[PDB]
Specification:
The complex is a heterotrimer, with 2 copies of chain A (82 residues) and 1 copy of chain C (190 residues).
Chain A: H1 4-20, H2 27-42, H3 46-62, H4 66-78
Helix pairs in contact in A: 1-2, 1-3, 2-3
Chain C: H1 8-30, H2 35-73, H3 79-96, H4 99-109, E1 114-118, E2 125-130, H5 133-139, E3 140-141, E4 144-147, E5 150-158, E6 182-188
Antiparallel strand pairs in C: 1-2, 2-6, 3-4, 4-5, 5-6
Helix pairs in contact in C: 1-2
Classes of the chains: A mainly alpha (82), C alpha+beta (190).
Amino acid sequence: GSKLTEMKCTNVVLLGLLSKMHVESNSKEWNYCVGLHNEINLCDDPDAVLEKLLALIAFFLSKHNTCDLSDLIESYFENTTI
Amino acid sequence: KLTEMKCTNVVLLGLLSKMHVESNSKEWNYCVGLHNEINLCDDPDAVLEKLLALIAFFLSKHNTCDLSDLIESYFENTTILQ
Amino acid sequence: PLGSVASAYAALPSWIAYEKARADLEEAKKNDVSPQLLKQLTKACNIAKSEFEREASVQKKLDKMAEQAAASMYKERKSKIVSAMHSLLFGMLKKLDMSSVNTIIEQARNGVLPLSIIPAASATRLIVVTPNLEVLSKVRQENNVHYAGAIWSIVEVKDANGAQVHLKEVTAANELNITWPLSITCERTT
């Protein structure tokens, strides 16, 4: 809702992270990522932005080893220093 | 007259060149303005908001632009993003 | 005329304006046109000349700026840079405090995450991983999967050995006998 810019800034960090994960090697996957990111930034409907953000987070989640991902969530999400 | 970047972000210069931003002084100064404001920010949230504005500008010129390198360069050059 | 300049293509619009102004004045001299028309044509030439010179120096500034920028970049991330983005990303996701974001993150923490998220096909394709019977029950709603705020229709289900699995057959009494995790291939109901 009111957290539209917060979701748009999260999206920017996600694309930055995805770019460092060398997704560029797969053109279909890269265009899907870049596509979602660009669409989020041009969209003003929060419902539509969340749907697309959920798709980007899921793509990001898939590019991780299940084991390391659990540690990453525990460290940075569950026990955040923000 | 065209404003200079305090700490030139090479990738930002590359987009200004690619999209011929020099032609429009108002547009160039808006971009350089956002860059200089990023370098003076005390807050990561405020930095991301300014990066989101630079992204919104380039996407207004090319809806499908891959801006992942701009995001990378800001994480790599701005101490607040570290 | 534009043989010494860096980019003749970039210099062209300002050069034509100057050359056209210079040519008018030269024709005006040869045709011994009125002193009034000559004064006008001289001013137009001075204006165009100073515009050509102004754009020529701007071009030199932009080229030097790029030359310098390239020379400093050439120097070229960290486990630290990736770590800083991970800290930012997960911090912001928590700060969002949206139930669907919390769901997706808690699922991933417990091993419920995508193996693959293949787009195009005019229908996005998700292969979801379900590590146990309890978690499988939360995401699977009959011949559908509820994941990432969407509903996906089940296409195929597989063993961790790649063997075909019938969902009707995955039951409480069977849990010990199934090689987990299960892979649910589903397509976005679009």
